[PDB]
């Protein structure tokens, strides 16, 4: 039987080279993921998986709080940090199982959504059953003790190798200095026109008046840039602006704040320029970002109760998520939700990720790389299997008992 | 016969999945395009088609004016705006026919001819866009067609510019709320950007006698191409020995018809301090909804002024700097190149030039539609790609054109449905 | 025989279309490369080749100086400048031979290796050090006699690569005769993210003229246009301080290739966020030799100051260095190094090669150059995959002692 | 296979449907021929009911300068089936639309057509403009764009289910009455369509007196009807004000916005304070009163106070629901699907010519039964499977519901050879 197909459908058996046309000298590796997550007091929670992520980021766990909000717990990664040993990567296959081990203890709903985290319209335990219309991309009310298996299915082949966000040789006065070469090919770009002759008007107030000009859903796991410019016009004298950008997490928490304008004084009758020159590095992102908002504070230094403060603005920003549109980098997303699990129980996660990799300079001295086994009918066979996906029942989310049966039905044929 | 081949060569029969290695779960759709364009007073005009555009923009119509300049009429799109229902797209196949359908009351004689050609570059790269000059835009005999009767019509057939192309983000709206009711937020076509680099000045010396109101110059003008969002960055550094000088700088994006599509202030009353590097950064983002017609050039204007100046004293400065124009997803094959031009002349004024076609796509639904639209990997068809490669390699022998006199394309369709 | 395989393994026989799925109407061309390089007084040197470069840049020659440093000699290009006639390109195959052709008044050996990273990533570039840059026995060759020479053969780093924009000039007019405008290689950018400071504390006693520091230095790679964006934010309690900041791009030989002012007499206001944006664009025509590092200099000054006056500030910030089209396979990696030593001073090291391309003509040439999809050859790709997978068994090298490569050619014909 | 021939080429005549609805019947073809006149905008719309089980083929509307459509006339079959038959089933049908003339002053060609088959009924379309129609369906074989009017378009009726029952034709029944204008028919009834509307749920109405009463429209809803329907239900009115009286009328509006039928549902109905005032409807709208397809219904209420004076108050609260039953409305083909043929830029005064054939399975009325033999119909073992095979390969075969006539003609040849 075809190694690649075996690897694709049964990732835990090991890696195999993707039988496409991306002929690069590489090496094959398997990285395990093991976590024992703790259940909060509502007995409900959510694990967000990035099934196709080309690297060490596997997912994020959130617990549902009594007030109905989610709260970030932690990231789910591979056993080792790939960027420390390799510079390029391609995902070959992956599978993870989620089940309670601190065992009749609750149920799981799981779905594979074709967009990115912030694009979900409903993330409730029952709402997720509608995120996709594909019957083989959703699974409902599986007992937590039996568990669910997430299987990564392709979102395109002939994908390029991805830079891993590996550190680069650098020295600096600051011991907290960080330098990396980031995943960049195939950037995702968001364009936000925040104002088109927007008129702001308000009575003076010591300390100024704050407004949130806009708030938009965006997705980011790794480095991103925010560029652009706002132009302000005013008839009033003595106004000064303070502007700040906030990147918010899925749990509503602020993840990043950046000053864009500080005591920026406005001159009457002229175009007042407010540029954006922001770069958010990966190490600063502590949990997935799902929204961005801009705050503007208007103030009049020598003002007094009664003066009117006003200005008009026009402008657009561009948010670039480096490598964001690389299939698997932000989309798709597989959600595994659980409810009614006894508080304090352990939700156990166990999986394998298989990659095609290019070693970093030091490791390259000892790691041989090759083009990889020629297998003439491997791709055709894969295309045949995936086109017959519904007839064969190949799911992205499975009740583990069924996936196990599926594995037998495959090895004994 | 191989459904993909049938869709490729006869787009109006419907869509089919591209038999390459880009295995994504998707859905297949057909969008029609129907337009009844009006002929201006010169009886001449030009339709610019973007045969490989991965989305709803099919082309643009320009009428030729008596003064010899073109004038933008309107964009030609698909029946519905794909970005409103889908987030990702790939072009499978497309064909459009152009022919006259009317004669205003009074004209007894039908008149008019069409010249059409497929140019492997983007709009602003054409060296000649006159009715007869187009015939030389390419050397490939199967990518040009001349003097076809307007009443018979021409058929534009989209031929591949590479397979295994990735899905493209459609410029779909994202969830957002704002104080401004005119606020707009989208996720744009970005993979494979096109980048233009312009060194506007390398120690350029500017010198001129003061003048109330300032002195204006146009530092440079360059041809670039943009249909959707783009950004402009970089910087100009100014040096001066004169005191009291201030600069005003503006960027202009010009359309194919010479008109200004977009203007952006880059510098406003920016004072220049002597014996210091004066910095003028560019931080411009031009969203898609602001581009009303294809952009074919960019130019930079600088206004030098001396507030407390009088007739007689000299104004001057030296500058150095570069800008980078990034067209988001601009180099995605089909996004800007290639271009198919259909020119017509001698058509009775007031007649109707009718456009009708179909576009076929592989699409990924937006979140709301994904709740009701099933997506799949798509029929396995073992020899479809080989057959496609064989047909295209024999393109000249088989006579598969990108532009056809419609009668011939119709004959070609029959000769195809018989042999298969 | 399958044309493509013949072209791939024996580039000097001419071009052939790559049998992948990138179906573009194109034309095929061969560009030769010929150089007679002069050996310096140490008798030692280094030629850096970009085997997969999609265009006219073939390599760079450096001589080793008595003091142990390298010194840039010149670039190695194709006979004609492709961007002047074509706008898009893909590399089909390439091979170059390096051998001594002169005696002034035998001498010397060559070590060569193909490294899977880019120039600045090499950990050791000495004649002997190179032998360990890779672990692949077929990507290194040692102590070949210079008179016999070495042959560098370009092997694929992925197929189904897109066409690359060539950096061709665009129509433009300007007041400055020195004005330059091009459309650059851009798809698949490489991005470096550098966090230069995270509340970095700076402090020093005044000094007429200012105190200079080099905040950081990092290795990066660039051959063609790149851009630098981002921002530094400065805080200070002292009054009257002003900053000057400069970016330097350094070449492989340690020399300064490019310098850009980022801040000039930028005064710092107390108790506020002082913004220092980066808006640099470095055009290809300004890069005279490969860039291997970037550093930032900051000069702090207090105009009206006197001994005892203390100058201090804290800073935070990140920059993003974007190398346009830098991650396109072949544009920066891999690199093939050919080092020679003990060659008589004043000798001629002769370089001779052929580069084969798929090209799309510029507008003017398109009027007379016919383009086509290219020969259908059903099993060409499979055969290529088979050959590359049996690379080790067949002994297909990226660097060869020329005599062996010649025997290999016969054994093939 | 005769059935297939009839289904794909209706003009060749009728054939029995090879399903399981074994009834003794007779087979007939009824032609449709119309010469429609183009209005001053040069634009118009013909609405076809491709699957209608009877003589109603369609309706023609012209587009007016103000942007609204104006009803011209119904398109029927040569003869009125209900006059000779009592039951019916549609076998197959096709119609062509093309211009056949030129108002003097124009000499070559003028006009284009957009056509589409929508799977809903008329009022359910979201956009009926010339260009908007192109999106009514996502099926490429159910739409056709910018066909030259001189060449024409062909509408081909494709099935919306088989094993459909026979439909009563709305035939007259023996009846005598004192009124010469009396009418009695047995209507299409099987498979009614039903709309349920809640017009008010404690709605508060409040207004100042006014001579003649104060009028309001409680609700307005899109519904579809071509033949008889009934409207039943009840409104309940509560009030604290004494002396109030209500007048309530139901309006059935046509596709062109005009009122087609009105029925009083309350006349001078006085409201008693502190009690539930009931207002029951029992409206039966017979087919002959419906002059053009109905696309909406609205409820008008006039509140008055006979002995009131300026400054007097009028208020009440209301609750109510109604059921609109379209007899036989959900019978497949009766209301849905619909095929729209839109034309524009046609010279004013030109003639848009319609020509088609409808094939039916029929059961004669009592008088005709005396002379018309009926039978079960040819046994054709594989006709149904062949039909199912052709329809499943619809996209591969290119079998359209709307065609540029030249292509349909080519399609006919390619079939008569194979
Ligand atoms: Ca491929
Ligand atoms: Cl890219």
Short mmCIF file of N, CA and C in Angstrom, two decimals, chain A residues 142-264:
data_model
loop_
_atom_site.label_atom_id
_atom_site.label_comp_id
_atom_site.label_asym_id
_atom_site.label_seq_id
_atom_site.Cartn_x
_atom_site.Cartn_y
_atom_site.Cartn_z
N UNK A 142 -20.70 13.28 20.95
CA UNK A 142 -19.90 12.09 21.16
C UNK A 142 -19.58 12.07 22.66
N UNK A 143 -19.63 10.90 23.28
CA UNK A 143 -19.31 10.86 24.71
C UNK A 143 -17.84 11.24 24.92
N UNK A 144 -17.57 12.11 25.88
CA UNK A 144 -16.21 12.56 26.14
C UNK A 144 -15.22 11.45 26.52
N UNK A 145 -15.75 10.39 27.13
CA UNK A 145 -14.94 9.25 27.52
C UNK A 145 -14.51 8.46 26.30
N UNK A 146 -15.37 8.40 25.28
CA UNK A 146 -14.98 7.70 24.04
C UNK A 146 -14.02 8.59 23.23
N UNK A 147 -14.31 9.89 23.16
CA UNK A 147 -13.47 10.82 22.44
C UNK A 147 -13.71 11.04 20.95
N UNK A 148 -13.02 12.04 20.45
CA UNK A 148 -13.18 12.44 19.07
C UNK A 148 -11.81 12.48 18.43
N UNK A 149 -11.72 12.18 17.14
CA UNK A 149 -10.43 12.24 16.45
C UNK A 149 -10.52 13.28 15.32
N UNK A 150 -9.57 14.21 15.32
CA UNK A 150 -9.49 15.26 14.30
C UNK A 150 -8.50 14.77 13.27
N UNK A 151 -8.92 14.72 12.02
CA UNK A 151 -8.00 14.27 10.97
C UNK A 151 -7.79 15.41 9.99
N UNK A 152 -6.55 15.73 9.72
CA UNK A 152 -6.32 16.83 8.83
C UNK A 152 -6.44 16.43 7.34
N UNK A 153 -7.35 17.03 6.59
CA UNK A 153 -7.46 16.70 5.17
C UNK A 153 -6.93 17.90 4.38
N UNK A 154 -6.29 17.66 3.23
CA UNK A 154 -5.71 18.75 2.42
C UNK A 154 -6.54 19.95 1.98
N UNK A 155 -5.90 21.10 1.96
CA UNK A 155 -6.51 22.34 1.51
C UNK A 155 -5.51 22.74 0.41
N UNK A 156 -5.40 21.90 -0.61
CA UNK A 156 -4.48 22.11 -1.74
C UNK A 156 -3.12 21.45 -1.57
N UNK A 157 -2.57 20.98 -2.70
CA UNK A 157 -1.24 20.39 -2.71
C UNK A 157 -0.40 21.33 -3.55
N UNK A 158 0.86 20.95 -3.77
CA UNK A 158 1.80 21.81 -4.48
C UNK A 158 1.91 23.16 -3.76
N UNK A 159 1.83 23.10 -2.44
CA UNK A 159 2.00 24.27 -1.62
C UNK A 159 3.51 24.46 -1.46
N UNK A 160 3.95 25.71 -1.33
CA UNK A 160 5.37 25.95 -1.17
C UNK A 160 5.82 25.67 0.25
N UNK A 161 7.14 25.53 0.43
CA UNK A 161 7.65 25.36 1.78
C UNK A 161 7.43 26.70 2.52
N UNK A 162 7.18 26.64 3.81
CA UNK A 162 6.95 27.86 4.58
C UNK A 162 8.14 28.21 5.49
N UNK A 163 8.51 29.48 5.56
CA UNK A 163 9.62 29.85 6.45
C UNK A 163 9.04 29.67 7.85
N UNK A 164 9.79 29.09 8.77
CA UNK A 164 9.24 28.81 10.10
C UNK A 164 9.26 29.90 11.18
N UNK A 165 9.79 31.08 10.91
CA UNK A 165 9.87 32.07 11.96
C UNK A 165 11.07 31.75 12.86
N UNK A 166 12.08 31.17 12.24
CA UNK A 166 13.33 30.78 12.88
C UNK A 166 14.14 32.02 13.25
N UNK A 167 14.91 31.94 14.35
CA UNK A 167 15.73 33.10 14.78
C UNK A 167 16.85 33.31 13.80
N UNK A 168 17.31 34.54 13.65
CA UNK A 168 18.41 34.81 12.71
C UNK A 168 19.60 35.31 13.49
N UNK A 169 20.82 35.15 12.96
CA UNK A 169 22.01 35.63 13.68
C UNK A 169 21.85 37.10 13.91
N UNK A 170 21.92 37.54 15.18
CA UNK A 170 21.80 38.97 15.49
C UNK A 170 22.42 39.26 16.85
N UNK A 171 22.88 40.50 17.04
CA UNK A 171 23.43 40.94 18.32
C UNK A 171 22.88 42.34 18.59
N UNK A 172 22.59 42.62 19.85
CA UNK A 172 22.07 43.94 20.17
C UNK A 172 22.32 44.33 21.61
N UNK A 173 22.27 45.63 21.87
CA UNK A 173 22.48 46.14 23.19
C UNK A 173 21.40 45.64 24.11
N UNK A 174 20.20 45.49 23.59
CA UNK A 174 19.13 45.01 24.42
C UNK A 174 19.12 43.47 24.54
N UNK A 175 19.19 42.93 25.76
CA UNK A 175 19.17 41.47 25.92
C UNK A 175 17.81 40.86 25.51
N UNK A 176 16.76 41.67 25.46
CA UNK A 176 15.43 41.20 25.07
C UNK A 176 15.22 41.36 23.55
N UNK A 177 16.30 41.55 22.81
CA UNK A 177 16.18 41.75 21.38
C UNK A 177 15.78 40.46 20.69
N UNK A 178 14.87 40.54 19.72
CA UNK A 178 14.46 39.34 19.01
C UNK A 178 14.49 39.57 17.49
N UNK A 179 15.02 38.59 16.76
CA UNK A 179 15.13 38.68 15.32
C UNK A 179 14.79 37.35 14.67
N UNK A 180 13.83 37.38 13.75
CA UNK A 180 13.41 36.16 13.07
C UNK A 180 13.11 36.31 11.58
N UNK A 181 13.11 35.18 10.86
CA UNK A 181 12.75 35.22 9.45
C UNK A 181 11.38 34.57 9.49
N UNK A 182 10.36 35.34 9.14
CA UNK A 182 8.98 34.86 9.26
C UNK A 182 8.25 34.24 8.10
N UNK A 183 7.24 33.46 8.44
CA UNK A 183 6.38 32.86 7.44
C UNK A 183 5.80 34.12 6.69
N UNK A 184 6.03 34.21 5.39
CA UNK A 184 5.59 35.37 4.65
C UNK A 184 4.92 35.12 3.32
N UNK A 185 5.35 34.12 2.54
CA UNK A 185 4.75 33.87 1.21
C UNK A 185 3.26 33.79 1.38
N UNK A 186 2.52 34.34 0.43
CA UNK A 186 1.05 34.32 0.47
C UNK A 186 0.46 35.15 1.64
N UNK A 187 0.81 36.44 1.72
CA UNK A 187 0.25 37.24 2.83
C UNK A 187 -1.26 37.42 2.71
N UNK A 188 -1.93 37.63 3.85
CA UNK A 188 -3.35 37.94 3.83
C UNK A 188 -3.37 39.46 4.06
N UNK A 189 -4.25 40.17 3.36
CA UNK A 189 -4.34 41.61 3.55
C UNK A 189 -5.77 42.10 3.81
N UNK A 190 -5.92 42.89 4.86
CA UNK A 190 -7.21 43.49 5.21
C UNK A 190 -7.10 44.98 4.95
N UNK A 191 -8.10 45.55 4.29
CA UNK A 191 -8.09 46.97 4.04
C UNK A 191 -9.29 47.59 4.74
N UNK A 192 -9.02 48.50 5.66
CA UNK A 192 -10.05 49.18 6.42
C UNK A 192 -10.06 50.69 6.15
N UNK A 193 -11.16 51.21 5.60
CA UNK A 193 -11.30 52.66 5.39
C UNK A 193 -12.06 53.07 6.65
N UNK A 194 -11.32 53.60 7.63
CA UNK A 194 -11.88 54.01 8.92
C UNK A 194 -12.76 55.25 8.88
N UNK A 195 -12.44 56.16 7.96
CA UNK A 195 -13.17 57.42 7.83
C UNK A 195 -13.13 57.96 6.41
N UNK A 196 -14.24 58.58 6.02
CA UNK A 196 -14.42 59.19 4.71
C UNK A 196 -15.18 60.49 5.02
N UNK A 197 -14.41 61.48 5.45
CA UNK A 197 -14.97 62.76 5.83
C UNK A 197 -15.85 62.60 7.03
N UNK A 198 -15.35 61.89 8.02
CA UNK A 198 -16.10 61.68 9.22
C UNK A 198 -16.01 62.96 10.05
N UNK A 199 -17.15 63.42 10.54
CA UNK A 199 -17.20 64.63 11.36
C UNK A 199 -17.28 64.34 12.84
N UNK A 200 -16.26 64.77 13.57
CA UNK A 200 -16.22 64.59 15.00
C UNK A 200 -16.48 65.93 15.65
N UNK A 201 -17.38 65.93 16.63
CA UNK A 201 -17.70 67.15 17.31
C UNK A 201 -18.06 66.93 18.75
N UNK A 202 -17.49 67.72 19.63
CA UNK A 202 -17.80 67.54 21.02
C UNK A 202 -17.38 68.72 21.85
N UNK A 203 -18.09 68.91 22.96
CA UNK A 203 -17.82 69.95 23.93
C UNK A 203 -16.49 69.64 24.61
N UNK A 204 -15.70 70.68 24.89
CA UNK A 204 -14.42 70.52 25.57
C UNK A 204 -14.59 69.74 26.88
N UNK A 205 -13.50 69.21 27.40
CA UNK A 205 -13.53 68.42 28.62
C UNK A 205 -12.10 68.22 29.04
N UNK A 206 -11.78 68.56 30.28
CA UNK A 206 -10.40 68.37 30.69
C UNK A 206 -10.11 66.88 30.54
N UNK A 207 -8.90 66.56 30.11
CA UNK A 207 -8.57 65.15 29.93
C UNK A 207 -8.97 64.62 28.55
N UNK A 208 -9.73 65.40 27.79
CA UNK A 208 -10.10 64.97 26.46
C UNK A 208 -11.29 64.04 26.36
N UNK A 209 -11.69 63.81 25.12
CA UNK A 209 -12.81 62.94 24.79
C UNK A 209 -12.33 61.74 23.95
N UNK A 210 -12.70 60.55 24.37
CA UNK A 210 -12.28 59.35 23.66
C UNK A 210 -13.35 58.73 22.78
N UNK A 211 -12.95 58.32 21.59
CA UNK A 211 -13.89 57.61 20.76
C UNK A 211 -13.20 56.38 20.18
N UNK A 212 -13.99 55.37 19.85
CA UNK A 212 -13.42 54.20 19.22
C UNK A 212 -13.95 54.39 17.81
N UNK A 213 -13.06 54.73 16.89
CA UNK A 213 -13.46 54.97 15.50
C UNK A 213 -14.05 53.74 14.81
N UNK A 214 -13.44 52.57 15.03
CA UNK A 214 -13.93 51.34 14.42
C UNK A 214 -13.39 50.11 15.14
N UNK A 215 -14.03 48.98 14.84
CA UNK A 215 -13.62 47.72 15.39
C UNK A 215 -13.92 46.71 14.28
N UNK A 216 -12.92 45.88 13.93
CA UNK A 216 -13.10 44.88 12.85
C UNK A 216 -12.50 43.53 13.19
N UNK A 217 -13.12 42.46 12.69
CA UNK A 217 -12.62 41.11 12.94
C UNK A 217 -11.48 40.81 11.95
N UNK A 218 -10.36 40.32 12.47
CA UNK A 218 -9.25 39.93 11.63
C UNK A 218 -8.61 38.73 12.31
N UNK A 219 -7.71 38.04 11.63
CA UNK A 219 -7.11 36.89 12.28
C UNK A 219 -5.64 36.93 12.22
N UNK A 220 -5.01 36.60 13.34
CA UNK A 220 -3.56 36.55 13.30
C UNK A 220 -3.07 35.64 14.38
N UNK A 221 -2.07 34.82 14.05
CA UNK A 221 -1.46 33.92 15.01
C UNK A 221 0.00 34.33 15.11
N UNK A 222 0.59 34.73 13.99
CA UNK A 222 2.00 35.12 13.96
C UNK A 222 2.17 36.55 13.45
N UNK A 223 3.40 36.99 13.18
CA UNK A 223 3.62 38.40 12.84
C UNK A 223 2.73 39.06 11.81
N UNK A 224 2.50 40.36 11.99
CA UNK A 224 1.65 41.16 11.11
C UNK A 224 2.12 42.62 11.09
N UNK A 225 1.66 43.39 10.10
CA UNK A 225 2.01 44.81 9.97
C UNK A 225 0.75 45.64 9.76
N UNK A 226 0.76 46.88 10.25
CA UNK A 226 -0.38 47.76 10.05
C UNK A 226 0.19 49.04 9.50
N UNK A 227 -0.25 49.42 8.29
CA UNK A 227 0.25 50.61 7.63
C UNK A 227 -0.90 51.47 7.18
N UNK A 228 -0.59 52.66 6.67
CA UNK A 228 -1.66 53.54 6.23
C UNK A 228 -1.61 54.93 6.86
N UNK A 229 -2.71 55.67 6.72
CA UNK A 229 -2.72 57.04 7.18
C UNK A 229 -4.08 57.68 7.36
N UNK A 230 -4.22 58.46 8.41
CA UNK A 230 -5.46 59.19 8.61
C UNK A 230 -5.09 60.65 8.40
N UNK A 231 -5.95 61.39 7.72
CA UNK A 231 -5.75 62.82 7.50
C UNK A 231 -6.85 63.58 8.21
N UNK A 232 -6.44 64.49 9.08
CA UNK A 232 -7.38 65.31 9.85
C UNK A 232 -7.42 66.79 9.44
N UNK A 233 -8.63 67.35 9.43
CA UNK A 233 -8.90 68.76 9.12
C UNK A 233 -9.68 69.35 10.29
N UNK A 234 -9.43 70.62 10.59
CA UNK A 234 -10.10 71.28 11.70
C UNK A 234 -10.10 72.78 11.52
N UNK A 235 -11.10 73.42 12.13
CA UNK A 235 -11.23 74.88 12.12
C UNK A 235 -10.87 75.43 13.48
N UNK A 236 -10.87 74.56 14.48
CA UNK A 236 -10.58 74.97 15.82
C UNK A 236 -9.11 74.94 16.09
N UNK A 237 -8.65 75.86 16.95
CA UNK A 237 -7.24 75.96 17.33
C UNK A 237 -6.98 75.24 18.61
N UNK A 238 -5.72 74.84 18.78
CA UNK A 238 -5.30 74.17 19.99
C UNK A 238 -5.71 72.73 20.24
N UNK A 239 -6.14 71.99 19.22
CA UNK A 239 -6.51 70.59 19.44
C UNK A 239 -5.30 69.66 19.29
N UNK A 240 -5.26 68.61 20.09
CA UNK A 240 -4.18 67.61 19.98
C UNK A 240 -4.81 66.20 20.05
N UNK A 241 -4.27 65.27 19.27
CA UNK A 241 -4.80 63.92 19.25
C UNK A 241 -3.87 62.88 19.79
N UNK A 242 -4.48 61.87 20.38
CA UNK A 242 -3.78 60.68 20.87
C UNK A 242 -4.53 59.54 20.19
N UNK A 243 -3.79 58.63 19.58
CA UNK A 243 -4.45 57.51 18.92
C UNK A 243 -3.75 56.20 19.30
N UNK A 244 -4.53 55.16 19.53
CA UNK A 244 -3.95 53.87 19.85
C UNK A 244 -4.66 52.69 19.14
N UNK A 245 -3.86 51.68 18.75
CA UNK A 245 -4.38 50.48 18.11
C UNK A 245 -4.38 49.35 19.12
N UNK A 246 -5.46 48.59 19.16
CA UNK A 246 -5.54 47.43 20.05
C UNK A 246 -5.84 46.16 19.24
N UNK A 247 -5.14 45.08 19.55
CA UNK A 247 -5.41 43.82 18.89
C UNK A 247 -6.04 43.00 20.00
N UNK A 248 -7.25 42.52 19.77
CA UNK A 248 -7.96 41.77 20.79
C UNK A 248 -8.00 40.27 20.54
N UNK A 249 -7.96 39.50 21.62
CA UNK A 249 -7.99 38.04 21.53
C UNK A 249 -9.40 37.48 21.46
N UNK A 250 -9.50 36.19 21.14
CA UNK A 250 -10.80 35.52 21.02
C UNK A 250 -11.57 35.64 22.33
N UNK A 251 -10.85 35.78 23.44
CA UNK A 251 -11.54 35.89 24.71
C UNK A 251 -11.91 37.30 25.12
N UNK A 252 -11.75 38.25 24.21
CA UNK A 252 -12.10 39.64 24.52
C UNK A 252 -11.01 40.48 25.18
N UNK A 253 -9.96 39.80 25.61
CA UNK A 253 -8.81 40.38 26.25
C UNK A 253 -7.91 41.16 25.29
N UNK A 254 -7.24 42.20 25.79
CA UNK A 254 -6.34 42.93 24.92
C UNK A 254 -5.04 42.15 24.84
N UNK A 255 -4.57 41.91 23.63
CA UNK A 255 -3.33 41.18 23.47
C UNK A 255 -2.15 42.11 23.18
N UNK A 256 -2.41 43.17 22.41
CA UNK A 256 -1.40 44.15 21.99
C UNK A 256 -1.99 45.57 21.91
N UNK A 257 -1.19 46.55 22.32
CA UNK A 257 -1.57 47.97 22.20
C UNK A 257 -0.37 48.70 21.60
N UNK A 258 -0.63 49.61 20.67
CA UNK A 258 0.44 50.38 20.03
C UNK A 258 -0.01 51.82 19.86
N UNK A 259 0.86 52.75 20.27
CA UNK A 259 0.59 54.17 20.12
C UNK A 259 0.81 54.51 18.64
N UNK A 260 -0.11 55.25 18.07
CA UNK A 260 -0.03 55.60 16.68
C UNK A 260 0.14 57.11 16.58
N UNK A 261 -0.38 57.79 17.59
CA UNK A 261 -0.30 59.24 17.67
C UNK A 261 -0.22 59.65 19.14
N UNK A 262 0.70 60.56 19.45
CA UNK A 262 0.86 61.01 20.83
C UNK A 262 1.05 62.52 20.88
N UNK A 263 0.03 63.19 21.39
CA UNK A 263 0.02 64.64 21.51
C UNK A 263 0.24 65.24 20.12
N UNK A 264 -0.38 64.63 19.13
CA UNK A 264 -0.24 65.09 17.77
C UNK A 264 -1.11 66.34 17.63
#
